[PDB]
């Protein structure tokens, strides 16, 4: 699915942007946007990836 791949690329880009951020609120907003994009893609795997990214970002940045 091309749409799924594009959504995955966008999710990874958002995760990369969040990883190099200093304000945890900005990272939370980016992760919320990524979760919304994953929900729009209708793929459980993308939701799982977003959930894991949230955990990793919250641990490392927070």
């Amino acid at each position: 699915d091309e749409k799924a791949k594009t959504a995955e690329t966008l999710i990874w880009q958002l995760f990369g942007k969040a990883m190099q951020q200093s304000d945890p609120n900005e990272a939370e907003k980016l992760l919320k946007k990524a979760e919304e994009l994953a929900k729009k893609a209708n793929d459980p795997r993308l939701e799982q990836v977003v959930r894991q990214h949230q955990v990793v970002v919250r641990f490392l940045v927070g």
Partner: antibody
Amino acid sequence: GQIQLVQSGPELKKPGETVKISCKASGYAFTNYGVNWVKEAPGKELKWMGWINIYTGEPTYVDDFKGRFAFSLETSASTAYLEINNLKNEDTATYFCTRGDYVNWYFDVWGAGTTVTVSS
Amino acid sequence: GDVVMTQIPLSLPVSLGEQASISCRSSQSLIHSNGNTYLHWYLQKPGQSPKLLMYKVSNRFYGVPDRFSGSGSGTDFTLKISRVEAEDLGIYFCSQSSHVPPTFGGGTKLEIKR
């Protein structure tokens, strides 16, 4: 191409010197994983040394491996460097650079390993 | 401190065409907060780098033959080979990633019995 990591050849050193080992990655997007280092001593267990994140370059070491060891990156050439200072006789071992994942947290791709031997 | 992994047995003599079992035991609970249990099994052959065999207790990595199986929970985990072959000899060890830092077991060596 085949996903792989390439490391330099064996090293023979004398105490008090400094060594530098390189690890070059090929076959994937270098900025979407983490680079972990593992040390294997003869007749002992594998020991996690630390990991470096490609996004910011900030390394993380275990307590035992602080001070004398250094991690560095060359993103343009897709290379990771491990630098060791003030060598001893206890540093004779084999070093692996491995790729670590962000979703399942395993080490799936391993390098061939570089042997470092220190003796006078 | 660091989680301690103990493997049983240290040397396992097995014969081609039979089943083998290896046990890994942690010092504490490996169940992560989010719900998944991160226990992985690696295999190393003489003169080569280790290769991943199993990830997250019982899943199978791509390319691994179907005869490998994993099971367990809590602090007891087990790997089972239904039909050993000549290419399955080596050193197997477990690892965890649920508590910083990851640690590796001592390793069990498989050899032919006579």
